[model samples]
Target: KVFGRCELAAAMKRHGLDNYRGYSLGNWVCAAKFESNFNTQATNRNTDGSTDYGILQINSRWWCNDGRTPGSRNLCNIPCSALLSSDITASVNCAKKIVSDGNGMNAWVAWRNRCKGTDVQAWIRGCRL
Candidate 1:
């Protein structure tokens, strides 16, 4: 699912992404914009030999287990392929784990590059919360 800006925001909020551990909904939404362009099936293999999967680009490095990543700890305890589902339930849950694990949403470099120091609320303007 390639989501519209507001559509993805709505979904993220419903999944408890709003103000989750001090990260705003817009931060997550904005990160999604640059990470995978809100496409739920997006996957990109990195030169580091890890593949990022799904809308949030959850990586196979230390999060999900792709069965191919050299040292994947499977911290999310889910197959990396699970993150590619359009439903996003598993993806969201795993993301919560990542955040609460002290990763602080800074684990994703895209967020640091594009959303780290911006008026991220603009990402969800007119979403009506």
Candidate 2:
């Protein structure tokens, strides 16, 4: 785990993601909460043998190689372990590419499944940008 909700917001904002790709900071924070609970070290193996990495839960099937997964596009061209670092620079950079690819936050299933159309003020309440 890396940060609490407020810390995460501030960190992401500092990374230039406050309103990156037309998505709100609240939405990004909320998606991270559901995706990996703000834990940089988080990893979850999917039923399809791909694993999600870090707070964004970037997939091994497309974004990065986790060694053992086949057909990974490795679009980020970084190891999945890089996403597990306390430093979020690589992770955010990869996430930005994902958004720029027209996925936006929709690239994350957690965003689509739980955060869409949901009131997310609470996610950023009391957090100063």
Among these predicted structures, which one has the highest lDDT? Answer: 1
Q: lDDT value for candidate 1?
A: 0.90
Give candidate 2's TM-score.
Answer: 0.94
| Model 1 regions lying over 4 Å from their true place | none
Candidate 1 residue-wise lDDT, 1-129, digit = tens? 899999888888899988998999999999999999999999999999999999999989888988898966788889988988878888899899988876698888899988998999999999977
Q: What local lDDT does model 2 show for residue 122?
A: 80
Cα lDDT tens digits for candidate 2, 12-128: 998988789888899989999999989999999999899999989999898988897987679999999999998888788889998888766788888999998898768999987
What C-alpha lDDT do the candidate models reach, one value each?
A: 0.90, 0.89
TM-score of 1: 0.95
**Weakest 10 consecutive residues, lDDT, candidate 2?**
101-110
What candidate 2 gets wrong by more than 4 Å, as runs, is none
| Pairs of residues clashing in candidate 2 | none
Q: Report the Cα lDDT for candidate 2.
A: 0.89
